[PDB]
RNA sequence: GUUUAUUAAAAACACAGCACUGUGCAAACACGAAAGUGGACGUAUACGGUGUGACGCCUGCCCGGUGCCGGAAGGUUAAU
RNA sequence: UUGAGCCUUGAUGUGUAGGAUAGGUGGGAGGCUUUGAAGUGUGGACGCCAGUCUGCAUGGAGCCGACCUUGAAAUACCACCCUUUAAUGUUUGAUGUUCUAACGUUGACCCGUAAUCCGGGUUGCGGACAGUGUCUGGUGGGUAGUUUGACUGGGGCGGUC
């Protein structure tokens with residue numbers, strides 16, 4: 046979220062953004078509410094993540 | 097109206113001028129708290145008698161609170177009978193009611209608090225000097241000579 | 246009643262002439278106003294129901310003379 | 323008029339467009355530029371390139387207080403989110419610290435429904 | 440000043456480069472911008488011209504000495520017609536027009552004369568004195584004025600050059616005289 | 630309940646209920662050239678005006694016209 | 710000190726044959742800058758981000774004109790300045806800020822007074838506002854006064870004058 050990155054380097058170096066926000070919770074909340082269907086959605090994040 | 101003022105009065109007045117003021121200001125503020133008055137003509141010459149008198153007359157009378165000192169340098173020497181210790185150093189000493197009382201008591205009539213002997217005021221014999229006061233700007237010098245008799 | 250204690254101005258009647266010259270009876274009231282006046286010669290406030298013209302008369306003659314008229318005709322103030 | 327040197331480049335990157343605002347530390351708006359403000363409309367503006375040329379335009383506008391080193395605050399998804407800070411680096415800028423400020427409700431307001439497309 | 444401080448030119452080299460650039464009204468209705476015939480200006484000034492008139496094969500031995508330096512010929516009506524870098528002025532009148540020798544297609548040169556008895560008449564001075572000044576863009580009067588050789592002596596124009604105040608438009612205020620060039624700038628009033 | 634006292638008692642008026650809309654109180658409003666007074670010894674859960682008329686189920690589309698409400702840049706525009 | 714009158718101290722312009730972003734005509738065949746320049750480099754900045762400018766500066770010693778085209782020729786110099794803006798004014802109101810002392814108080818108190826009137830006084834709150842007079846535009850069936858034709862195979866409609 047925050048990067049001090051002092052002296053030598055003009056490369057951004059903010060890969061921290063691909064560690065939380067962005068399409069993280071932001072693609073999430075962007076649209077269709079959901080409500081109970083995430084239940085089903087996450088029941089594939091595990092029916093998969095079993096193996 | 098015109099109205100002629102009394103006291104100094106801020107961003108317009110003077111002390112006895114003939115300004116011109118909005119009537120709302122004249123009634124309601126100025127004249128009631130007598131800081132001015134209707135220029136009823138009757139008045140504007142009530143003021144012309146007051147344009148000759150005190151000014152033209154009593155400033156050549158302060159030309160007498162001034163020419164008192166035309167008789168401050170035309171003598172320019174009073175002596176005080178005050179002696180001397182162990183070498184011509186005053187056995188006496190003379191101040192303001194000594195240099196105003198030993199000034200008055202002749203043809204040189206001054207008001208006792210009109211004699212500035214800055215201190216020396218005073219501590220030895222012989223000739224000295226002093227600052228004689230009659231007007232605010234015109235004083236005058238003399239010479240004083242404490243005579244050891 | 247709408248009367249200027251200085252000048253005696255009171256309502257008068259006249260006409261409202263329309264564009265077509267139709268007359269309708271009307272009035273003209275005077276610019277009356279109750280106004281406190283500092284009488285120096287009395288260490289007191291005398292308030293007079295006066296017309297604006299009234300005031301100007303008081304400004305010129307001077308409240309002393311003016312009241313001195315009301316007084317001289319028992320117009321009590 | 324006036325002068326700064328130590329500043330902040332705020333960016334509002336959002337699918338449809340990205341907007342660059344450059345203000346001092348005490349965020350009092352020193353200059354701005356939008357993807358639409360420059361050209362491109364429709365797809366066009368909702369692109370990293372279009373956001374570059376706005377990041378650019380914004381310089382020739384705040385350089386008018388000779389800014390030297392400035393932080394960057396990045397809000398929203400969408401292009402121009404990073405491509406903007408590149409056009410900023412180059413523009414002629416010591417670019418101090420970078421932060422992301424996209425808001426995250428702790429699940430509050432129900433967001434819009436649909437997009438049966 | 441009341442008139443003008445004609446001592447308003449105390450460095451170029453010869454400050455005669457001055458002009459008559461006064462002010463006139465507007466066109467709220469119908470008025471125009473014109474000049475008479477060679478406005479001479481009550482002042483010898485000191486101008487020798489090369490006045491170009493369109494006489495014929497007789498007016499070359501006396502229609503050329505009267506404040507000028509030549510006159511277009513008869514063979515040179517269109518035998519001076521073969522170039523743009525090769526070629527006051529004139530155009531005689533009565534019943535004679537000259538669009539066959541000044542017409543279509545960017546210069547002004549109208550006043551020369553019209554005589555049925557002479558080429559240099561017994562009393563005909565006034566031509567080679569001062570220029571013209573028709574319509575421009577935001578007013579009129581452009582031309583020339585006094586010189587570095589005068590004093591308040593070129594202010595003979597001041598009472599008979601600013602006095603050229605002919606009927607002003609309508610909704611206007613025509614009145615303001617000015618000149619100068621090659622040192623500073625200015626004018627007084629009207 | 631009311632009403633055409635004396636040719637009409639009614640489906641007309643009122644009505645509880647509803648809706649609009651005005652009103653910060655020296656209220657709006659109303660009787661008064663005015664002072665004064667009702668509104669009210671009340672104060673927006675109050676007071677006025679207008680419509681509709683228990684209740685049940687309900688009360689859609691139109692703001693071009695006419696009224697009203699808001700607007701401020703232009704235009705036009707009084708005495709002066 | 711904000712919106713208008715207007716006046717000194719200054720800007721400014723991609724119609725073709727082209728060294729190249731020609732305002733219309735006018736003085737015009739040499740002014741000047743060492744009272745210290747052309748443009749490199751950033752400062753305010755008008756913005757059709759096509760380019761222009763200078764208080765300042767790194768700078769440090771010439772550029773050009775009828776030249777051959779174009780219905781119109783010099784960024785060689787000067788101005789009366791239009792396409793439209795921008796920086797003090799002058800006063801004048803003007804929107805504005807306070808003040809209090811006119812004026813309002815249907816706050817509190819005091820006295821005339823064993824009085825919810827009124828008058829005077831003291832205070833608090835307002836305040837040159839509000840309100841009223843005169844003039845003035847608008848609105849104004851609330852009120853008022855009237856008008857709203859005649860011929861006609863009755864009158865009206867139609868028609869006619």
Ligand SMILES: [Mg+2]
Nearest residue numbers: 633635636637
């Ligand atoms: Mg009956």
Ligand SMILES: [Mg+2]
Nearest residue numbers: 633636637638
């Ligand atoms: Mg019956």
Ligand SMILES: [Mg+2]
Nearest residue numbers: 675676677678
């Ligand atoms: Mg009600």
Ligand SMILES: [Mg+2]
Nearest residue numbers: 642680681682
């Ligand atoms: Mg009904």
Ligand SMILES: [Mg+2]
Nearest residue numbers: 850852853854
């Ligand atoms: Mg009627």
Ligand SMILES: [Mg+2]
Nearest residue numbers: 859860861864
């Ligand atoms: Mg009939």
